[PDB]
Enzyme design. Structure first.
Site, PDB file in Angstrom:
ATOM      1  CB  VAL A 133      -4.143   1.640   2.800  1.00 16.25           C
ATOM      2  CG1 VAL A 133      -5.044   2.846   2.999  1.00 16.25           C
ATOM      3  CG2 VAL A 133      -4.998   0.367   2.809  1.00 16.25           C
ATOM      4  CG  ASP A 134      -5.515   5.942  -0.300  1.00 17.49           C
ATOM      5  OD1 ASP A 134      -4.922   5.654   0.747  1.00 17.49           O
ATOM      6  OD2 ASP A 134      -6.026   7.038  -0.467  1.00 17.49           O
ATOM      7  CB  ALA A 135      -1.640   1.560  -3.635  1.00 17.03           C
TER       8      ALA A 135
END
Length: 350
Positions: A133-135
């Site tokens: 998700v950090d992407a």
């Protein structure tokens, strides 16, 4: 009651401490690069030429590149820190700052590598580049910043196509939050108390990402209403799990599993809520209480007297159920997140 003067003192205290303590000649990997997103936010708010030169000196040192391999046959898109990891988004968040610096003083060299890498990526048939998700924070704002420069419409189509794949893996439609990667969805994985496990900093990255996308996406873009709807829904879900103290816990809906204050998720959420209210996408009366509690936590508890920012969950450590975050845990990327929130708070005070 709180004044812009007082907030600017905080901003400068935090940013000057960091820049006085750390030379800009460090690698362009995500943690430094997120700090630079914060610094560029401060430069937008303040026009400070020394702060600008700190980012320029970092970009110059990294030769306006992320990971450095020139052999596209070896380029990888999973986690790594060596030069072949060119298509891994933690080596692409630097491009946000390179684009920002190009807009100020255009020079084709500043965005040559960003264009080479993202244009090659978009030429591949692979779609699952944003598999954690950090992407979304690392890369979604690259797409709108590169579009702003190139006017190449593929950036905005691939923004949607990659995010659609992220959603298919991690987005919980019922809750309105993202699991941090494919290991975490319910019911196969549950918290210690049998709950759905939504990582706070993960959802912070996503929520701040959508704000950054909406800040620069053209008004006419065909997917803009999808992004607004996602942002507004996340705002409501995030608000609903705020702790009374104003922070969010690391497992958003199981505070007992990973208890107590955590700053980096909180700061990303605060940024997103302030931006949303300031830009007319979130109702001020509904969300202003959420931001008051959050900002009060950030200003009173996370911020230390000398400008250090504490209670930042560390990187890459296995979860220890019941264990609190160390007050003294401070990292570049968390200072970056704090600065986004602080800058937007100045804008909220008018």
């Amino acid at each position: 009651t709180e004044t812009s003067e007082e907030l600017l003192e905080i901003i400068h205290r935090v940013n000057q401490r960091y820049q006085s303590m750390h030379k800009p000649q460090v690698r362009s990997f995500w943690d430094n690069a997120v700090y630079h997103t914060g610094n560029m936010e401060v430069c937008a708010l303040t026009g400070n030429k020394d702060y600008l030169q700190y980012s320029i000196d970092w970009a110059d040192y990294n030769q306006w590149k992320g990971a450095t391999s020139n052999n596209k046959a070896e380029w990888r898109s999973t986690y790594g820190e060596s030069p072949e990891y060119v298509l891994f988004g933690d080596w692409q968040v630097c491009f946000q700052t390179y684009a920002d610096l190009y807009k100020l003083d255009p020079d084709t060299i500043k965005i040559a590598r960003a264009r080479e890498v993202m244009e090659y990526q978009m030429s591949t048939s692979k779609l699952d580049y944003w598999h954690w998700v950090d992407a979304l924070y690392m890369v979604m704002p690259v797409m709108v910043k590169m579009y702003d420069i190139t006017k190449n419409p593929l950036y905005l189509e691939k923004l949607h196509q990659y995010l659609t794949v992220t959603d298919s893996i991690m987005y919980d439609r019922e809750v309105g939050l993202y699991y941090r990667d494919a290991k975490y969805p319910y019911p196969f994985h549950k918290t210690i108390n049998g709950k759905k496990d939504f990582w706070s900093r993960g959802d912070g990255w996503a929520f701040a990402a959508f704000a950054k996308v909406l800040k620069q996406l053209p008004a006419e873009d065909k997917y803009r209403e999808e992004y607004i709807t996602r942002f507004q829904t996340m705002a409501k879900s995030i608000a609903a799990c705020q702790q009374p103290e104003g922070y969010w816990t690391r497992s958003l809906i199981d505070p007992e599993q990973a208890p107590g204050p955590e700053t980096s998720g909180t700061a990303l959420f605060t940024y997103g809520f302030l931006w949303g209210i300031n830009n007319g996408l979130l109702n001020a009366d509904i969300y202003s209480p959420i931001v008051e509690k959050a900002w009060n936590y950030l200003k009173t508890t996370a911020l230390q007297a000398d400008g250090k920012i504490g209670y930042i969950q560390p990187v890459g450590e296995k979860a220890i159920p019941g264990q609190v975050v160390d007050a003294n845990s401070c990292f570049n990327f968390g200072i970056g997140a704090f600065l986004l929130a602080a800058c937007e708070r100045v804008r909220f005070l008018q």
